[PDB]
Amino acid sequence: FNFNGLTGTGVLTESNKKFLPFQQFGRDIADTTDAVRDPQTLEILDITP
Amino acid sequence: GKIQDSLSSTASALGKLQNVVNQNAQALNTLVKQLSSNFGAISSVLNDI
Numbered sequence: 001f002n003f004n005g006l007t008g009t010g011v012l013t014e015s016n017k018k019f020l021p022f023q024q025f026g027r028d029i030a031d032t033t034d035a036v037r038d039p040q041t042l043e044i045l046d047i048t049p
Numbered sequence: 050g051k052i053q054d055s056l057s058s059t060a061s062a063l064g065k066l067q068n069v070v071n072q073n074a075q076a077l078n079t080l081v082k083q084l085s086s087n088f089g090a091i092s093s094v095l096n097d098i
């Protein structure tokens with residue numbers, strides 16, 4: 001997956017966690033790239049390798 | 050009866066085990082948190098560079 005800034009390998013699934021319209025990228029207490037907002041369709045996706 | 054009441058009520062007396070667990074967890078956290086360090090480079094992501 002290459003979401004406009006991020007090369008990597010992971011399973012892309014649908015998420016249910018609420019996102020602020022200003023917030024796109026998500027982190028964790030283990031500060032890893034968890035969620036992402038697709039540009040074409042404003043949809044929130046979780047990444048899990 | 051007294052000892053079972055004491056174990057039911059007071060929770061700090063088990064710390065002898067509890068501390069152990071905490072210690073282990075702490076280490077792992079730091080290790081993971083060590084990934085987000087520049088170490089003098091330009092970024093903390095191998096894919097980025």
Ligand SMILES: *[C@@H]1O[C@H](CO)[C@@H](O)[C@H](O)[C@H]1NC(C)=O
Pocket residue numbers: 039040041
């Ligand atoms: C981008 O273009 C496609 C095709 O014209 C369109 O379906 C899509 O809605 C556009 N993106 C946005 C955010 O409107």
